[PDB]
Amino acid sequence: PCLTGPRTCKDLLDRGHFLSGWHTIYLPDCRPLTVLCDMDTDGGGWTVFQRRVDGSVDFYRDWATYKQGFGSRLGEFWLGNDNIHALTAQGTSELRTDLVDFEDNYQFAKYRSFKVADEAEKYNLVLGAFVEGSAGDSLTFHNNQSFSTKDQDNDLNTGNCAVMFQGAWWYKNCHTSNLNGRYLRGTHGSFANGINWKSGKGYNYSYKVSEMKVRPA
Amino acid sequence: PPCLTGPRTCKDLLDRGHFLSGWHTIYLPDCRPLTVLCDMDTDGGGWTVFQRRVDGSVDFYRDWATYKQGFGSRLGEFWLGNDNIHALTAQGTSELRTDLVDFEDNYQFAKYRSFKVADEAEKYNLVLGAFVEGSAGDSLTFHNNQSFSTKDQDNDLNTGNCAVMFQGAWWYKNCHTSNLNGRYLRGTHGSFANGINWKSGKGYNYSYKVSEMKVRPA
Amino acid sequence: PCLTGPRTCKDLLDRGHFLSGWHTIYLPDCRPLTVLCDMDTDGGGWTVFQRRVDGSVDFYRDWATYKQGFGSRLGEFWLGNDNIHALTAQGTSELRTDLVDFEDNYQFAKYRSFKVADEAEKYNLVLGAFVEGSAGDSLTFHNNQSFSTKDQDNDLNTGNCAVMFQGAWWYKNCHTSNLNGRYLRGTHGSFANGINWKSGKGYNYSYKVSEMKVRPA
Ligand SMILES: CC(=O)N[C@@H]1[C@@H](O)[C@H](O)[C@@H](CO)O[C@H]1O
Ligand SMILES: CC(=O)N[C@@H]1[C@@H](O)[C@H](O)[C@@H](CO)O[C@H]1O
Numbered sequence: 001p002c003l004t005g006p007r008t009c010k011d012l013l014d015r016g017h018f019l020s021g022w023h024t025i026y027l028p029d030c031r032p033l034t035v036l037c038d039m040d041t042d043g044g045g046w047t048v049f050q051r052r053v054d055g056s057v058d059f060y061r062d063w064a065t066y067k068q069g070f071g072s073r074l075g076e077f078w079l080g081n082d083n084i085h086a087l088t089a090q091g092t093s094e095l096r097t098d099l100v101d102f103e104d105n106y107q108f109a110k111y112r113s114f115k116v117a118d119e120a121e122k123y124n125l126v127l128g129a130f131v132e133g134s135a136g137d138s139l140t141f142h143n144n145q146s147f148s149t150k151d152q153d154n155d156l157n158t159g160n161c162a163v164m165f166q167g168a169w170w171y172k173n174c175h176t177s178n179l180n181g182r183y184l185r186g187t188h189g190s191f192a193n194g195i196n197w198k199s200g201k202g203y204n205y206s207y208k209v210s211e212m213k214v215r216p217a
Numbered sequence: 218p219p220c221l222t223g224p225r226t227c228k229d230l231l232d233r234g235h236f237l238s239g240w241h242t243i244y245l246p247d248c249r250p251l252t253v254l255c256d257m258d259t260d261g262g263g264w265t266v267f268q269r270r271v272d273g274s275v276d277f278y279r280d281w282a283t284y285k286q287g288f289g290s291r292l293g294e295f296w297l298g299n300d301n302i303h304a305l306t307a308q309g310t311s312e313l314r315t316d317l318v319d320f321e322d323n324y325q326f327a328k329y330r331s332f333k334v335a336d337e338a339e340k341y342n343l344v345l346g347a348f349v350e351g352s353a354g355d356s357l358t359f360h361n362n363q364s365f366s367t368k369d370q371d372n373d374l375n376t377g378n379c380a381v382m383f384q385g386a387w388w389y390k391n392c393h394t395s396n397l398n399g400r401y402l403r404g405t406h407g408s409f410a411n412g413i414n415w416k417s418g419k420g421y422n423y424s425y426k427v428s429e430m431k432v433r434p435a
Numbered sequence: 436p437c438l439t440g441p442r443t444c445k446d447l448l449d450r451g452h453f454l455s456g457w458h459t460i461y462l463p464d465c466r467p468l469t470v471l472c473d474m475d476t477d478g479g480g481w482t483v484f485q486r487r488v489d490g491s492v493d494f495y496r497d498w499a500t501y502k503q504g505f506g507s508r509l510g511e512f513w514l515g516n517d518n519i520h521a522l523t524a525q526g527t528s529e530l531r532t533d534l535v536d537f538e539d540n541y542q543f544a545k546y547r548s549f550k551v552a553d554e555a556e557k558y559n560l561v562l563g564a565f566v567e568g569s570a571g572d573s574l575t576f577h578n579n580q581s582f583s584t585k586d587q588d589n590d591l592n593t594g595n596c597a598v599m600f601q602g603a604w605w606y607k608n609c610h611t612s613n614l615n616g617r618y619l620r621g622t623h624g625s626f627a628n629g630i631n632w633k634s635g636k637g638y639n640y641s642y643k644v645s646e647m648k649v650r651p652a
């Protein structure tokens with residue numbers, strides 16, 4: 001199947017798959033991966049590597065777990081850092097972030113290009129220009145930063161950001177966005193440890209839905 | 218353009234011991250593979266679901282193209298696409314079932330001897346057989362023999378645009394007695410007949426919680 | 436095909452399926468079966484055979500229907516007794532149960548082993564022994580009874596305990612756990628006919644989430 005197999009959800013849309021769902025694709029080295037395709041948002045063809053929807057999965061996970069990926073196809077997941085690297089290493093994927101609050105308001109953020117490096121470079125975030133988006137730009141702040149988890153500190157803070165904000169991210173000192181934070185359901189008293197996006201609903205409101213997804217430029 | 222290679226319907230799949238509802242691949246007429254939702258439970262099981270509404274998560278007020286190719290998500294609401302549905306019902310003779318749930322969790326249903334839609338050439342003309350039964354009453358025969366319409370394709374019998382007037386996409390006459398691709402208005406609504414409505418069921422001013430349209434070989 | 440594909444969800448996790456979802460496996464007799472793998476909980480690699488989550492599937496069913504299996508891959512289901520049998524047939528696997536109340540508190544129970552008797556010998560519950568559950572042991576009391584359903588009495592009682600409590604279970608005058616009971620959606624005014632587990636919520640409260648699952652040792 002690797003021969004002439006689809007490489008991204010875009011190929012799958014081009015080839016006539018118009019329903020959002022899980023399909024297998026073939027990574028550059030030919031490894032088959034089953035991924036979530038968003039065929040609807042902003043013209044479709046997006047590969048979704050992060051989804052938050054209901055609080056059912058625990059995102060406070062170690063480096064090994066973020067490495068291989070975790071969660072469920074029936075709901076919330078992180079595709080895996082090795083997987084994300086592979087999806088974004090060769091070519092130019094743009095990045096969309098879709099956000100939904102509990103009052104059912106939708107907001108987004110689109111970036112001109114998105115790439116994460118291999119495990120040897122700490123899954124370094126390399127992020128292109130902010131394009132448009134009502135959610136406002138809350139990821140540029142994180143550009144060119146290593147990824148970190150509770151058991152592996154690569155931040156620019158004297159503490160551990162992933163522990164202080166109970167998540168995992170390309171934290172610097174510490175964060176403006178925190179989509180892998182705890183599912184706190186709306187406004188929360190604690191500071192910045194929920195699924196947050198500063199420019200969007202700020203450090204004190206934890207989104208209901210979060211999706212992170214890539215498409216070839 | 219039927220495939221003898223493998224399973225042509227959810228019925229075939231049920232027959233080969235697939236007892237759980239879910240997405241499965243069937244083989245249409247030119248052995249074109251399609252992943253479809255099978256209802257393995259309702260009324261003996263083996264129904265292929267081509268329309269599903271559940272939570273209002275997906276926008277159903279879409280244009281011709283979008284309805285032609287299909288839209289939505291396997292995790293939730295979808296319209297299988299008019300090409301797909303035609304392809305599904307062109308060969309043979311399929312029962313149609315409509316299952317409906319209100320927000321008190323009351324179940325209603327309608328059933329029809331046969332259902333097909335013509336190809337795009339003929340505007341996905343609906344061709345419906347006799348009503349068999351159902352607590353929801355018959356709010357579909359009125360639509361027998363009409364072209365499909367969307368908001369950017371008026372093929373109806375009103376001097377206006379039914380799809381715009383009633384925010385949906387359907388085999389609009391002048392205009393309708395069902396509007397299952399209407400807006401998801403959660404129960405009662407004061408607007409007229411622009412919800413997930415079935416006239417003989419909960420009238421023109423109530424929009425259902427769940428709607429499912431499915432076929433099965435007679 | 437058969438001699439090269441996985442025979443439990445564990446095998447699939449060892450081959451690098453880190454996300455929970457439906458995958459097909461091959462039983463002892465080479466018949467293929469598509470089962471839900473929990474790749475997440477407790478090291479992952481669990482084949483899930485029962486699942487309650489939203490009360491959308493009628494669990495008030497007969498012998499035949501429990502025999503073949505019923506429900507929706509998208510939601511709630513019973514994998515079916517001769518599958519559950521086929522799975523737990525040759526070898527030995529640990530049963531773990533996972534419960535979640537309508538305020539999002541987690542409770543589980545593990546058992547050294549779990550298997551059901553075949554079509555012939557009714558569906559006799561052959562448990563293992565309790566070992567470390569925050570929801571207590573509400574199943575040891577059921578070890579060694581036949582499965583019974585509204586149309587088949589195999590319990591130790593004058594009336595159908597399954598008709599009494601609208602469930603299907605290894606009953607015996609009567610029950611301490613009613614996982615196939617009704618989804619009475621939390622606090623309820625009838626007795627022992629919800630998705631009940633004594634040690635956990637008592638007899639008049641019905642869980643938000645229930646899952647039973649197995650894994651080799
Ligand atoms: C990928 C998929 O299944 N569809 C998601 C949907 O679940 C989400 O609620 C919304 C936010 O844009 O739309 C899509 O991103
Ligand atoms: C997976 C699926 O098809 N969904 C079920 C369907 O069996 C049925 O139409 C309806 C009640 O009839 O309940 C839905 O949730």
Ligand SMILES: CC(=O)N[C@@H]1[C@@H](O)[C@H](O)[C@@H](CO)O[C@H]1O
Pocket residue numbers: 056057071072073074075076455471472473474475483646
């Ligand atoms: C637990 C299980 O085996 N089922 C998965 C679970 O990992 C996930 O957290 C949940 C989300 O709805 O349901 C299923 O996708």
Ligand SMILES: [Ca+2]
Pocket residue numbers: 153154155156157158159160161
């Ligand atoms: Ca540090």
Ligand SMILES: [Ca+2]
Pocket residue numbers: 371372373374375376377378379
């Ligand atoms: Ca007109």
Ligand SMILES: [Ca+2]
Pocket residue numbers: 588590591592593594595596
């Ligand atoms: Ca009895």
